[PDB]
Amino acid sequence: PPSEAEEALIKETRLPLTGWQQEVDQGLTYGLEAAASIKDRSIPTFSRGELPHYAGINTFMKAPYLEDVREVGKYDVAIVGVPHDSGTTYRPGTRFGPQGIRRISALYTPYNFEMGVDLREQISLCDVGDIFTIPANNEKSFDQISKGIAHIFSSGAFPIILGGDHSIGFPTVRGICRHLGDKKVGIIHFDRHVDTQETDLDERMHTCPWFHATNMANAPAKNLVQLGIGGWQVPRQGVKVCRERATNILTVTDITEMSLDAAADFAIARATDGTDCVWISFDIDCIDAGFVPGTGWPEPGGLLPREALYLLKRIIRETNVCGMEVVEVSPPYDISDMTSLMATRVICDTMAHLVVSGQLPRTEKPAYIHAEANMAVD
Amino acid sequence: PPSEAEEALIKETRLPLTGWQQEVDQGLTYGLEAAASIKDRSIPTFSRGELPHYAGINTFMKAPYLEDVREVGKYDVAIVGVPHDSGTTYRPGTRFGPQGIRRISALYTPYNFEMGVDLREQISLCDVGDIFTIPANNEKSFDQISKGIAHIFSSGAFPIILGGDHSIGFPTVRGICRHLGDKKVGIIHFDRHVDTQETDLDERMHTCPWFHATNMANAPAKNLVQLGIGGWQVPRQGVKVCRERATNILTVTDITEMSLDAAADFAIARATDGTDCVWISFDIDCIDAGFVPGTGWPEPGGLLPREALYLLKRIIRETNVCGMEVVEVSPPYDISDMTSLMATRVICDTMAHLVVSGQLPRTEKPAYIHAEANMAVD
Amino acid sequence: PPSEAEEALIKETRLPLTGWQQEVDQGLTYGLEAAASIKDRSIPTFSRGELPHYAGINTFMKAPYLEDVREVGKYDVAIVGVPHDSGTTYRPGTRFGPQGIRRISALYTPYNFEMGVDLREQISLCDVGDIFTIPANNEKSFDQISKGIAHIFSSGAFPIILGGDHSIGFPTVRGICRHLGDKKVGIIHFDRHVDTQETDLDERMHTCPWFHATNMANAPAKNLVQLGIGGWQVPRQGVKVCRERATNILTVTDITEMSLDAAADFAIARATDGTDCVWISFDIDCIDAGFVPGTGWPEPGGLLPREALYLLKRIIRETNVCGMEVVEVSPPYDISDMTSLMATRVICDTMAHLVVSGQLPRTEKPAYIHAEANMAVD
Amino acid sequence: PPSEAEEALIKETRLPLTGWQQEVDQGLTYGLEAAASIKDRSIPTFSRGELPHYAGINTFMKAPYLEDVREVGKYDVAIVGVPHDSGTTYRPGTRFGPQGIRRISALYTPYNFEMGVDLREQISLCDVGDIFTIPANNEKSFDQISKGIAHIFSSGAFPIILGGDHSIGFPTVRGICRHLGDKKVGIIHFDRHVDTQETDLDERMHTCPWFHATNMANAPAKNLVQLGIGGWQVPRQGVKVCRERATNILTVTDITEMSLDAAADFAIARATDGTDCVWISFDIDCIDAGFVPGTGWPEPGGLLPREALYLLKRIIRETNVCGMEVVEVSPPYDISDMTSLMATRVICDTMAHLVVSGQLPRTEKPAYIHAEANMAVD
Amino acid sequence: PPSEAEEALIKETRLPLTGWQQEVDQGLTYGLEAAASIKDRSIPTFSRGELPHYAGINTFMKAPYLEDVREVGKYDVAIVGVPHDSGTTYRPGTRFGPQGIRRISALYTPYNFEMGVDLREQISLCDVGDIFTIPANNEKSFDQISKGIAHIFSSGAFPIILGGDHSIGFPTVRGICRHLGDKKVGIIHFDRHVDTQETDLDERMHTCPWFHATNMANAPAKNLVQLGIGGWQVPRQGVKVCRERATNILTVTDITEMSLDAAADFAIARATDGTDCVWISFDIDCIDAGFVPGTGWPEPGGLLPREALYLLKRIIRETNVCGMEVVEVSPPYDISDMTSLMATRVICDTMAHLVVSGQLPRTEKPAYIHAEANMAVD
Ligand SMILES: [Ca+2]
Ligand SMILES: [Ca+2]
Ligand SMILES: [Ca+2]
Ligand SMILES: [Ca+2]
Ligand SMILES: [Ca+2]
Ligand SMILES: [Ca+2]
Ligand SMILES: [Ca+2]
Ligand SMILES: [Ca+2]
Ligand SMILES: [Ca+2]
Ligand SMILES: [Ca+2]
């Protein structure tokens, strides 16, 4: 058989360069041709585009900033920041998650070697900026989040949420469910922590999103899949809810003992049994603490990066994904954006798996998207 | 007499709110009205504008990003980043100066209390992004810098350069001089270091800009004013040039002994005697090292922040300023953007002094701006 | 005249050692005598007390932890943490302010050289731990804060609040006013920022405490003194309130130009004219940013440490102080607890000035303390 | 069979102590005997040698500094720093790579437990300091690097290069090839990134070394082995060159799927097929980002430390190695020299594998070293 | 009158370049001529000497490392590290003080602008490395320190000690006194802390050096001058000793109120009245904590850098100085070597004041140096 590297070289030949040339051409018009001493005449005077990586205004992957969010339906993918840390029960700082992710994403090119995907050539991506979150009122912030996510989801753009603490899992899923009609969504949750209790410190904090999301008819708790649960921070109150609502859990040791392929098989089967789409909710703290210091609830003995990324390869390519959030990156506790980088990799890999599996670009709005918002979903 | 505080309260009443309302209105159109639970209906769903400060895409002071640089002449002020550290002789990292300055500038409002200036109401400001610098070839990077700065300067927009190491003082001033005709520019240089030697490590590095700038006829060395020189890093080769070319120097002890007012009088008189405009070149390392850890050549015993800022009040308001650069901020060596914040304060104070003194907005292009570039200035 | 140092040596002779011996004796009983090889038989086996400074459980200044808060009236001073950052409009992290202050306070002894004060000998101090704050609901957190501060204040113990963001200035002052009857309190506010607007991001955040506090009859806005206001972060909305309510403001330049003694005279006269006590609200960001990197709204050109500490000497010793809060220390943004240390110094100096001026220990409850809570003060 | 630990105890008995005693004796002569209260009379007054580890002047592993580089041929191994970051396309800082590596190397002893190697007893090692690099002119810096590396290589000393960004792979290999005559060198490249494009930002940067090295007749692209390629930073321009020149690539997943032994077999076979020696070029970023934060292009999902070190065991012991470089350590982005430590381990393990396999010390100059420099190799 | 800057330009003309040329010439011999593309033929291939500043082996100011300490009497100044933190009562880490000072000293040139001093031209300086300190036994470490300092002092070289915690003040002064015969030394001590108690934590720690030093007949307590004492960390036990032994103390407020000139007059008069030489003992924590975060006992409200440096100008130039130590730099708590830089500035300024005042180079051994060690001084 050919190696992955040998296939990668062949796949690269199949990718076009029209998106690259478009950016070069616009850069030369809007940034001027370079000074006379520059030999490569694709270089402008003012950086306009990907290069140099260390320069420029940092939107996610230097995607266009879409100021007018009413136009978001014109894009295959919309990156949206949710700078919300009012749900944090230990360290705050994840209100800057979106900023750290955007900053470090400038290191990347739009191309993935192993998969032969070039997002600049194969999808349209925009960055719509951030939800106007409300630090002093978690519930008001939830209402802002749901309205913005509902707007993006109903437009047909695929939403990728930069968190923000995990409490946002309730208002993001609520925003989706406002436009699901009677369709059902399975939640695939990567986390050490079950996040299923009712209240924490008198409010609906990051330990509580799935209690409230699975109270909605569109999100069955029996289709909630929780990958990586364990350690010393899993609240007993949440465990009780998982047991009584019959959620689907694998610990880290379950995953490594059964094999990653069997663990992914479990997640796919359980999340899709009686649902129409799947929501991916990736808590960066599911990765062993040694790789993600910039997070509020680090825990040793988590998933290693290649394990988490392989699980994503299986799950994203084999389910109908309606959106994703990557939560709990907390830049004030990070070192050289290590944790933001891990989150960026999850986001970019996910987009590439959606391309490989033919889910993006979409040729039509998915059947599960309903234009009228059901404001009584919760 | 009335206190500064009493005058500030009166001055604030004289400022309009049309620029504020314009941003609110655009934010509501482009970011949607807020969710129903939000009481303040100036708040949108998506952050679009100043608020929240911790959110959004970080251009300088959240000014509009001007993608099409050919339109820069429509703005009173253009912020331009010069992410260039090929001139550094000790620590690199100031290629990220523009990024750190943009990031921390989100903390500011457009309004200065003591001066009664609101930049959102009184000027138009844009951020044109960054010059496409050339890390492996200082001279090519210089050529890019001069072309971009010449473009901005000739448009009539007032250029504010975010450095970048001090080597850029040559290509920025060269860019200006390309459009000065036979007019002369006095350079007011805040620094512990004279920056006047011919080469360093075989090239034109940050210790060399003024040797090469004052070789140009438009920039007389006799009008170069160097405020703060001293310590253990001033190269003897540069001192020799200062002596032979008769530059105007005050040490930190000279400044504090003679009084800040007398020091400013000296700078104004010497920089304007036989010149038509003044270029401000502010090396962040002129501030005592305890306030600016994120820099390549820190030195104890520098200016204290209030001293540097008072000197700027006198100098900016009493000279005809053609542009400014703030150089040597090196975020990798900083703590919580302390050094970027000091540079942001210098930049914003300067804009406010230009407003107070009636230099901005301009009612016409200044007499010293010539449309045709003299590419043989150097 | 004798120098301050000469007076300090004489003052030290006047201090007893009974409090020291009491701690040594308890340490030997509860921590055992030392191993046989230890020569100094005041040393125990287990650290119990001040020594070693790097060891032990970190309450503030290693004061006794008062588990049963119903007993707080037995102490001259009660340290209370308010780990609240739901009012932050830029960086969070000041929910850990109390932790950083407690940690670094282990460096101190109970004795101040220049003042000849030994708090271990001259007052009883306890640490009551922290208010149970509510990160997801600023208003609920306010209600907790007011109840706890009211409890401490009404007991007769002098309350020192470790913040926490400045939004807590409303619930702390509200807690005091619940027990002031019809007596009036003047607020002496050290800050670059006026903190007087009505709402921010739809809530009562750290820019808003004094709008809401001076709406209470017991806290006249005409007695609010604001020392250090200036820079680029002072919201215009707050300036409008200061003007319309006639608060008393001095900028940093006002203070340094008029002399610290004249500035203190102004603060004392204005805060005490028609009031019965004074509340001290010290925002750590009033100190120049170079000294306080661990804060959410740093600003260059602030007060230097010796200036702020001298103002405190004048103000604390010459007013009848009912309590104090030190706010906005944000350890995640600090370097080696520099900012926590500055706050610790403010707190300890204040206690020493209260001792020097004869305000502590109290011989009786002050006339302004009313036992029944007026829950309708706001 | 005996365990590795059991073999290690036996191997240690076979190592002499003459090199240790020589250092002790010189230390006592040059550093004086210890004060009278010191019992171990191998201790001097002044640290001179390995001990204490936290003390002294930090050459690599506290090896002798060879001031006169003309004498380098007297040593089995010469450590040379290349403080060069003009080839960096994102973060600079690797100009301090050599400093960080030297600093943290003081933690090590000269002895490896598992291999039973003591470099103080079995080889002569010197530190020749650093190449005088040229930050403002990448090409001039390349010329300095090639001259210095050619000098060391032609002397018969085994060169170990402390980088410095990967752009130096061209001038280091060029320096070797100047003295290879018509002999051929296979390059074994550990990296996530192919580093094979022609120019980047108009120059020959760290993404370009192997394009230019394999243009030389002595370095066949068909013998270039690239271990670990993948992620989102592999430039398409480089992939095209790899395909057209038929380089040998394994991804991380290829390596882990095929087994480390099979991956090493592949590297050995392909790099030695038609070559006379092998150059090892180890980019620290081939290790998963969680272990190497101090680097310019970190990437998740890389090699784990034990995987990289096992590959080195197989490859170094089973090829004729002519030199090695370890590149891209960037101390400004590191935490407690973690990344410098990983690079130190690679360097020291490599020396030990050369000893175990009988490649060092050399009994004669290798047949492939030619005394006359071919300055036209490129 | 001429400004300091005008005098500096004239003074620079009076300095030779023979020391510079000597280093250039040796660098070209030992580091080879540069590659052909380098235009400045003073540049070698291998860095050998001052340049580049970011390169090379870091001895203090890149001075020659004197391996054979028996030759130290051939040098005007000997830098000696004392990597000792067994006397620390709060934070350790100052065992790395010498390393941080050496590292950051590479930023400096040998020339001071304001004073017109070039140490490369006017003195011979060596770095003798570090004392072999004994972390587990403070008293054994003291014995090593005294033997090494006695050796350097008796040779006629001027000793500059890089600490290390202040406990070393006893063994360093003891080393000097072993060679003072019956001559007397006045100690000028810059510190917030008196450092005069008998024991701390059962041993002679950094709070105790002057108790034990002034027990020696050669060091009269009545000539001990303590500049900057104050704050909350001054132990009462030490204050008692200061009072009973009649030491000479000025607080920070004493110094600023009386004027720096009067404070220096006091220090000079009191330290020299009945003594033959003066020992300078500079605790970095005498500087306000905002400038020196890397220290074990930081304190707000200290000296500002320019104040401390001016005091040194007066004191060093007007006393007969026999040696100096700069203590308590703790790199693990520093930010970007800020604190090491302040200590480097103190050291270099001191050398320059010794040159300006004609104390170095010495034309003969000072009358107070006795060749035979009096081992019974203590
Ligand atoms: Ca979670
Ligand atoms: Ca979690
Ligand atoms: Ca400069
Ligand atoms: Ca400078
Ligand atoms: Ca405040
Ligand atoms: Ca404030
Ligand atoms: Ca590489
Ligand atoms: Ca790489
Ligand atoms: Ca001391
Ligand atoms: Ca001290």
Report the 10 Å Cβ neighbour count for D349.
20
Q: Which residue of B has its CA nearest to E105?
A: B232
Report the 10 Å Cβ neighbour count for B143.
21
Token pair of D280 as six digits = 């090892």
User: Cβ contact (<8 Å) for B88 and D135?
Assistant: yes
β-bridge partners, B111: B118
Written as one letter, the residue type at B181 is: G
Q: Are A173 and A214 in contact (CB under 8 A)?
A: no
Q: What is the DSSP letter of D290?
A: G
d(CA A62, CA A82): 18
Q: Are E164 and E134 in contact (CB under 8 A)?
A: no
> Any idea which residue has 């005294």 for tokens?
E146
Peptide bond into D298 cis (omega under 30): no
Q: Tell me if B191 is assigned to a ligand binding site.
A: yes
In Å, how far are A323, A330, B337 from A169, measured between CA atoms? Answer: 11, 17, 31
DSSP string, B288-335: -GGG--SSSS--SS-B-HHHHHHHHHHHHHTS-EEEEEEE---GGG-S
Q: What are phi and psi of C313, to 5 degrees?
A: -55, -50
Burial of C33 (0-12, 13-18, 19+ CB in 10 A): middle
Q: Which of residues 250-279 of D touch A (CB under 8 A)?
A: 250-254, 256, 258
In Å, how far are A242, C159, E298 from D106, measured between CA atoms? Answer: 52, 51, 29
| H or E stretch at D257 | helix D252-258
Q: Which of D25, D15, D43, D27 is nearest to D111 (CA)?
A: D15
D166 touches chain B (CB under 8 A): no
DSSP string, A7-22: HHHHHHHTS--HHHHH
Q: Are A314 and A260 in contact (CB under 8 A)?
A: yes
d(CA D158, CA D156): 6
β-bridge partners, A187: A279
| Helix, strand, or coil (residue D24) | helix
d(CA E22, CA D132): 18
Chains in contact with A, where contact requires at least 3 CB pairs less than 8 Å apart: B, C, D
Peptide bond into A323 cis (omega under 30): no
B103 touches chain E (CB under 8 A): no
Q: Which residue of D has its CA nearest to B165?
A: D136
- Regarding chains D and C, contact by 3 or more CB pairs under 8 A is answered as no
Written as one letter, the residue type at A61 is: M
Q: Which of A7, A4, A129 is nearest to A59 (CA)?
A: A129
Residues with CB under 5 A from ligand 2 (ion): A 191, 193, 283, 285, 297
- How many residue pairs from chains B and E have C-beta atoms closer than 8 A? 115
Q: Are B327 and B281 in contact (CB under 8 A)?
A: yes
Q: Which of A223, A226, A235, A280 is nearest to A255 (CA)?
A: A226
Provide the pairing of β-strand E185-190 with E277-283.
parallel
d(CA B79, CA C116): 54
Instruction: Show Cβ contacts of residue D38 under 8 Å, excluding neighbours closer than 6 positions.
Output: E134, E140, E143, E144
Instruction: Show Cβ contacts of residue A224 under 8 Å, excluding neighbours closer than 6 positions.
Output: A186, A187, A189, A210, A214, A245, A247, A248, A271
Burial of D181 (0-12, 13-18, 19+ CB in 10 A): middle
Please write down the HEC assignment for all residues of chain C.
CCCHHHHHHHHHHCCCCHHHHHHHHHHHHHHCECCCCCCCCCCECCCCCCCCCCCCCCCHHHCCECCCHHHHHHCCEEEEECCCCCCCCCCCCHHHHHHHHHHHHCCCCCEECCCCEEHHHHCCEEEEEECCCCCCEHHHHHHHHHHHHHHHHHHCCEEEEECCCHHHHHHHHHHHHCCCCCCCEEEEEECCCCCCCCCECCECCCCCHHHHHCCCCCCCHHHCEEECCCCCCCCHHHHHHHHHHCCEEECHHHHHHHCHHHHHHHHHHHHHCCCCEEEEEEEHHHECHHHCCCECCCCCCCECHHHHHHHHHHHHHCCCEEEEEEECECHHHCCCCHHHHHHHHHHHHHHHHHHHCCCCCCCCCCCCCCCCCCCCCC
d(CA E278, CA A51): 61
Burial of D139 (0-12, 13-18, 19+ CB in 10 A): middle
User: Cβ contact (<8 Å) for C232 and B342?
Assistant: no
Length of chain D: 378
Q: Are B361 and B171 in contact (CB under 8 A)?
A: no
Q: Which of D128, D123, D117, D116 is nearest to D153 (CA)?
A: D128
Instruction: Show Cβ contacts of residue B267 under 8 Å, excluding neighbours closer than 6 positions.
Output: B188, B225, B227, B248, B250, B311, B314, B315
E136 touches chain B (CB under 8 A): no
d(CA E255, CA B3): 31
d(CA D344, CA D350): 10
Q: What are phi and psi of C49, to 5 degrees?
A: 125, -155
User: Cβ contact (<8 Å) for A135 and C332?
Assistant: no
d(CA E139, CA E290): 33
Sign of CA dihedral D153, D158, D164, D165: positive
Peptide bond into B331 cis (omega under 30): no
d(CA C263, CA C260): 5
d(CA D97, CA D81): 8
- Regarding chains B and D, contact by 3 or more CB pairs under 8 A is answered as yes
Instruction: Show Cβ contacts of residue C70 under 8 Å, excluding neighbours closer than 6 positions.
Output: none
d(CA E285, CA E163): 13
d(CA B295, CA B289): 9
d(CA A65, CA A53): 17
Instruction: Show Cβ contacts of residue B106 under 8 Å, excluding neighbours closer than 6 positions.
Output: B53, B54, B56, B58, B61, B62, C90
The closest ligand to the CA of B192 turns out to be 4
User: Cβ contact (<8 Å) for A132 and B46?
Assistant: yes
The alpha-carbon gap from D196 to the nearest alpha carbon of chain A, in Å, equals 13
Q: What residues in B contact A73, CB-CB < 8 Å?
A: none
Instruction: Show Cβ contacts of residue C180 under 8 Å, excluding neighbours closer than 6 positions.
Output: C218, C276, C277, C368, C369, C370, C374, C377
Largest CA distance in chain E: 71
Q: What residues in B contact E119, CB-CB < 8 Å?
A: none
Q: Are E59 and E103 in contact (CB under 8 A)?
A: no
Q: Are C223 and C277 in contact (CB under 8 A)?
A: no
d(CA B344, CA B58): 13
- Known binding positions of E for Ni(2+): 166, 191, 193, 195, 283, 285
Token pair of C124 as six digits = 């009883």
Instruction: Show Cβ contacts of residue A151 under 8 Å, excluding neighbours closer than 6 positions.
Output: A69, A72, B32, B45
After which residues, if any, is chain D broken (C to N > 2.5 Å)? none
Report the 10 Å Cβ neighbour count for A363.
5
| Helix, strand, or coil (residue A145) | helix
d(CA C177, CA C162): 19
| H or E stretch at D188 | strand D185-190
Burial of C70 (0-12, 13-18, 19+ CB in 10 A): exposed
Burial of D17 (0-12, 13-18, 19+ CB in 10 A): exposed
Instruction: Show Cβ contacts of residue C322 under 8 Å, excluding neighbours closer than 6 positions.
Output: C153, C158, C176, C185, C277, C278, C279, C366, C368
User: Cβ contact (<8 Å) for D34 and E147?
Assistant: yes
Q: Output the CA torsion B164→B168→B172→B178 (10° steps).
A: -150
Rounded to 10°, the helix C305-317/C260-272 angle is: 40
Token pair of C347 as six digits = 């707190």
d(CA A351, CA A61): 12
On the CB side of B217, CA atoms within 13 Å amount to: 10
d(CA E359, CA A346): 66
Burial of B10 (0-12, 13-18, 19+ CB in 10 A): exposed
| Helix, strand, or coil (residue B80) | strand
Q: Are C290 and E290 in contact (CB under 8 A)?
A: yes
C298 touches chain B (CB under 8 A): yes
Instruction: Show Cβ contacts of residue C26 under 8 Å, excluding neighbours closer than 6 positions.
Output: C48, C49
The closest ligand to the CA of C234 turns out to be 6
**How wide is the angle at C-alpha B251 spanned by C-alphas B250 and B255, nearest 5°?**
75
Length of chain A: 378
Q: E strands along chain E, which residues?
A: 77-81, 111-112, 117-118, 125-130, 158-162, 185-190, 225-227, 248-250, 277-283, 321-327
On the CB side of D205, CA atoms within 13 Å amount to: 23
Q: What is the DSSP letter of A52?
A: S
User: Cβ contact (<8 Å) for C309 and E290?
Assistant: no
In Å, how far are A149, D46, D49, D59, E175 from D32, measured between CA atoms? Answer: 74, 7, 13, 22, 15
Q: What residues in C contact A202, CB-CB < 8 Å?
A: 134, 136-137, 140
The alpha-carbon gap from C133 to the nearest alpha carbon of chain B, in Å, equals 22
Q: Which of C265, C87, C75 is nearest to C167 (CA)?
A: C87
User: Cβ contact (<8 Å) for D135 and B167?
Assistant: no
- Ligand 3 center from residue A25 Cα (angstroms): 36
Q: Which of D225, D232, D220, D166 is nearest to D195 (CA)?
A: D166
The closest ligand to the CA of C302 turns out to be 6
**What b/e string do you get for D19-41 counting C-beta neighbours within 10 Å, with b at 16 or more?**
bbeebbeebbebbbebbeebeee
Taking phi over 0 as left and psi of -120 to 50 as alpha, with beta for the rest, A195 belongs to: left
Q: Which of E174, E161, E377 is nearest to E284 (CA)?
A: E161
d(CA A309, CA D301): 8
- Ligand 6 center from residue D323 Cα (angstroms): 58
User: Cβ contact (<8 Å) for B290 and C294?
Assistant: no
Written as one letter, the residue type at D239 is: V
β-bridge partners, C326: C162, C282
Length of chain B: 378
d(CA A144, CA A160): 16
β-bridge partners, A46: B131
Q: Are B114 and B9 in contact (CB under 8 A)?
A: no
On the CB side of B291, CA atoms within 13 Å amount to: 29
Q: Which residue of D has its CA nearest to E66?
A: D30
Go through the domains of chain A in sequence order and give each one's CATH number.
4-357 (3.40.800.10)
Token pair of B300 as six digits = 């104890």
d(CA B12, CA E139): 66
d(CA D347, CA D101): 10
Provide the pairing of β-strand B248-250 with B225-227.
parallel
Q: Which of C83, C121, C284, C106 is nearest to C191 (CA)?
A: C284
β-bridge partners, A126: A78
